[PDB]
Amino acid sequence: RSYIIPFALLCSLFFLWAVANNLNDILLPQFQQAFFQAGLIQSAFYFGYFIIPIPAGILMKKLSYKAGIITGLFLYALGAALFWPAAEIMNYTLFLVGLFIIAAGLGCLETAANPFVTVLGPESSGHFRLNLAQTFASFGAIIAVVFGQSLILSNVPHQSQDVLDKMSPEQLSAYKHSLVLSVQTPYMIIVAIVLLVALLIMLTKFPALQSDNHSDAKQGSFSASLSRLARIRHWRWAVLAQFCYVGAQTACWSYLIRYAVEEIPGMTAGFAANYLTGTMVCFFIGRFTGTWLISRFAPHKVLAAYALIAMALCLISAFAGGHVGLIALTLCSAFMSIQYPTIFSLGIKNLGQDTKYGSSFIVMTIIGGGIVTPVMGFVSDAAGNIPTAELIPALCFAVIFIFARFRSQT
Numbered sequence: 587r588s589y590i591i592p593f594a595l596l597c598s599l600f601f602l603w604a605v606a607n608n609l610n611d612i613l614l615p616q617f618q619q620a621f622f623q624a625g626l627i628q629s630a631f632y633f634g635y636f637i638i639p640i641p642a643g644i645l646m647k648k649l650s651y652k653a654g655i656i657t658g659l660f661l662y663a664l665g666a667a668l669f670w671p672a673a674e675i676m677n678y679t680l681f682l683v684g685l686f687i688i689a690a691g692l693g694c695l696e697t698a699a700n701p702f703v704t705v706l707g708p709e710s711s712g713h714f715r716l717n718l719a720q721t722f723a724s725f726g727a728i729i730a731v732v733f734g735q736s737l738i739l740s741n742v743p744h745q746s747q748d749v750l751d752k753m754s755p756e757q758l759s760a761y762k763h764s765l766v767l768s769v770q771t772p773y774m775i776i777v778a779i780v781l782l783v784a785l786l787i788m789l790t791k792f793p794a795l796q797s798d799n800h801s802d803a804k805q806g807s808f809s810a811s812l813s814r815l816a817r818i819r820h821w822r823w824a825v826l827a828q829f830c831y832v833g834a835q836t837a838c839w840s841y842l843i844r845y846a847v848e849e850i851p852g853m854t855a856g857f858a859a860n861y862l863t864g865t866m867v868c869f870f871i872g873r874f875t876g877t878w879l880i881s882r883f884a885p886h887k888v889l890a891a892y893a894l895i896a897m898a899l900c901l902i903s904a905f906a907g908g909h910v911g912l913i914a915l916t917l918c919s920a921f922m923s924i925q926y927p928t929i930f931s932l933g934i935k936n937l938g939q940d941t942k943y944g945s946s947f948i949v950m951t952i953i954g955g956g957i958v959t960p961v962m963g964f965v966s967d968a969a970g971n972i973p974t975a976e977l978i979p980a981l982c983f984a985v986i987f988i989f990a991r992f993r994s995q996t
C-alpha cells in the first residue's frame with residue numbers, strides 16, 4: 587500500500603544522490619589538486635564516518651529517521667556551498683570546514699538511510715529492499731562516472747606540472763582561479779540536486795515505523811540501548827563482518843592498479859585503470875543479479891555464497907599471477923556487490939527500538955577501510971609482492987562467510 591511508493595521514491599532518490607555525490611567525488615581532486623595538510627582531509631573521513639554515526643543516531647532516536655535523512659542532506663549541501671566562497675577567495679580553512687561538514691552529512695545519511703529502507707516495510711523483505719535501493723545507488727555511480735565524468739572534465743584545465751612549474755606567480759595565480767571557476771557550476775548543480783531531494787523527502791509522507799517511536803522512558807537511554815545491543819550476537823557479529831568487508835573491499839580496489847602494474851609486463855598505471863573501471867561494472871552487474879537472487883533466496887545463503895566465492899577469487903588472485911590473478915581480482919567486485927547491504931540488514935533485522943543505535947555502530951566500522959591500508963602495505967612489503975597481500979581480503983571474506991552461517995537469532 588503506502589509502504590511502496592515512498593520506497594520507489596527512495597530508490598530513485600538513492601540513485602540521484604549517488605550521482606550527485608559521485609560528482610562531488612570527481613571534482614574534489616581538482617579543487618584540492620589545486621595545491622599535515624592532506625592528513626587533515628583523510629580525518630574528515632574518520633570524523634564523518636566514526637564520530638557523527640552515534641550522535642547522528644542520537645538525533646534519529648529523539649527525532650526520526652527522516653529527521654536524520656533531512657538533517658543529513660542539509661549538512662552535505664552546507665559543506666558543499668562552503669566551497670563557492672572558499673574557492674573564489676582561496677581560503678583553505680573555509681574549504682576544510684565545508685569538507686568536514688559534508689563529511690558529517692555522509693556519516694549522517696549513512697547511519698540514517700540504510701535502516702530506513704530495510705524497515706520501510708515487512709521485516710522479511712527488508713534485505714531485498716535495501717539491496718535494490720543500493721543497486722539504484724550503484725547504477726547512479728555508474729551514470730555519475732560514465733556520463734558526467736567525461737562530460738564535465740572538458741571544462742578542466744589540463745596542465746603538466748611541466749608547465750605549472752614554469753608559470754610565473756601571477757600566471758600560476760591566474761591558473762588556479764580558472765579551476766575554481768569550473769567547479770562553481772556543476773557544484774551548483776550538485777547542491778541543486780541535494781536540495782531537490784531534501785525537498786522531495788520533506789513533502790512525501792511516510793508510514794509509521796516501530797523503530798522510529800520515541801515511546802520510551804529511561805530504557806530508551808543510549809547506554810540502555812547499548813547494553814541491550816551487547817547481548818545480541820548476530821548484531822555483534824554483523825559489526826565484525828562489516829569491519830571486515832570495508833577492509834577487504836578497499837584492500838582490493840586500493841591495491842588493484844598497483845597489482846596490475848607489478849604483475850603484468852608491460853602494464854601502465856593509466857591502462858590498469860581500465861581493469862578498475864571494469865571492477866565497477868562488475869560491482870554493479872554483481873549487485874543487480876545478486877539482488878534478483880535475494881528475491882528467490884535466503885539473504886544469508888546468497889551472502890554466504892557470495893562471501894565464499896569472493897574469498898575464492900582472492901586466493902586465486904593471491905596465488906596465481908599475470909592476468910589470471912588480476913581478472914580474479916577485478917571479478918571479485920562482482921561478488922563484494924551484494925555484501926554491504928546484506929550484512930547491514932541481516933545485522934539489524936530485527937532490532938526494533940535499538941535499530942538506530944544499532945546502525946550508528948555498524949557504520950563506524952567503515953573505519954576499516956583506513957585500517958587495512960597499512961596492513962596491506964605492511965604484508966605487501968614483507969611479501970615482496972602485492973598478490974600475497976591479497977590474502978588479507980580473502981581473510982575478511984572468510985570471516986564474513988562465518989557470519990553468514992552464524993547470522994541468525996532466536
Ligand SMILES: CCCCCCCCCO[C@@H]1O[C@H](CO)[C@@H](O)[C@H](O)[C@H]1O
Pocket residue numbers: 596599600603604607608655695696699700720723724727783
Ligand atoms: C534521498 C536520500 C538518499 C540518501 C542516500 C544515502 C545512501 C548511501 C549510499 O551510498 C552511496 O551509494 C553508492 C553505493 O554504496 C556509492 O556508489 C555512492 O558513492 C555512495 O555515496
